[PDB]
Amino acid sequence: EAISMLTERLSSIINAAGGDIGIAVIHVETGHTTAIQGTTQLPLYSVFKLPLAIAVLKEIEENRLQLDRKVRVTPADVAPGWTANAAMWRRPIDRTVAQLIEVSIIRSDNTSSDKLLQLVGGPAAVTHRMRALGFPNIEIVSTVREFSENRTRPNTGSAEDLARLLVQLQKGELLQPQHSALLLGFMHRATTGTERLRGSLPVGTPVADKTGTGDAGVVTNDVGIITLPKGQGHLAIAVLISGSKLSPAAQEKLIAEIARAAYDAHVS
């Protein structure tokens, strides 16, 4: 029956991909869950910026921080190898906490993410916030710089915990309404995953997403929320691909095809 056999189809889409692949698809309103290796913790790379943004917004909601607090960013905060977004960080600049979350989510900025990581108390504090919220299978152990000088101790998370996190975000149970609207607005405008969760959906499908990419196709990740048409609800979806044999383009196409299969199963 269409959602019953989604696991069969997902398993054949990723067959012979090699590596380690975790998938979780959760229908937000009903809770219907489809998972493949859904409890295995896999390298997150830039996907960790989504738990980071939640921990930052929890700090504001727990009255230890403000959205409009000015934070000074200097070229000293940019790691050497960070080439993608470094153009905004060449002379000292003041950004509000809201603006730091913005650029870290939309542009997958490493510099602003590491600044936010310090504001909340480092990797251990984010890991604690995750279990305090109900997601004990998300372990943040490294800053972005630390991990960049040696890929050995990566931040990991299971696909099911990321999807469950997105379910509560979409439902309005995770953050205050204005913080939920603010974060989903950022994720709707994210520009790093045009070929992934959005790649194969029908024209006009709203998608909020956060990607993760390692160099040379070592890791290709995408987690997000797909708005179904009609009044059919939302899909929280996490795809974590680690160490695949496939080329980068084919790994992105794997994510796009997984999303379209989950979309098709849950739409009438």
Ligand X SMILES: *C(=O)[C@@H](NC(=O)/C(=N\OC(C)(C)C(=O)O)c1csc(N)n1)[C@@H]1N=C(C(=O)O)C(=C)CS1
Residue 254 or 265: the one with the smaller Cβ distance to ligand X is 254
How far apart CA 149 and CA 86 sit, in angstroms, is 17
Residue nearest to ligand X (CB): 46
C-alpha pair distances (Å), 240 with each of 18, 63, 123, 195, 228: 13, 33, 20, 15, 22
Site for ligand X in 62-121 (CB under 6 A): 84, 108, 110
Least distance CB 181 / ligand X (angstroms)? 24
Q: Contact between 128 and ligand X (CB under 6 A)?
A: no
Q: Contact between 151 and ligand X (CB under 6 A)?
A: yes
Q: Contact between 199 and ligand X (CB under 6 A)?
A: no
Binder to ligand X among 148, 194, 205, 232 (CB under 6 A)? 148
Least distance CB 49 / ligand X (angstroms)? 7
- Spatial strand order of the sheet with 234-242 comes to 33-36, 20-27, 234-242, 219-227, 207-213
And the tokens for 21? 């692949």
Nearest residue to 47 via CA among 200, 188, 209, 256: 209
Q: Amino acid identity of 249?
A: A
Residue 46 or 156: the one with the smaller Cβ distance to ligand X is 46
Residue 108 or 168: the one with the smaller Cβ distance to ligand X is 108
Q: What are phi and psi of 65, to 5 degrees?
A: -165, 160
| Interface ranges with ligand X (CB under 6 A) | 45-46, 84, 108, 110, 147-148, 151, 192, 211-215, 218
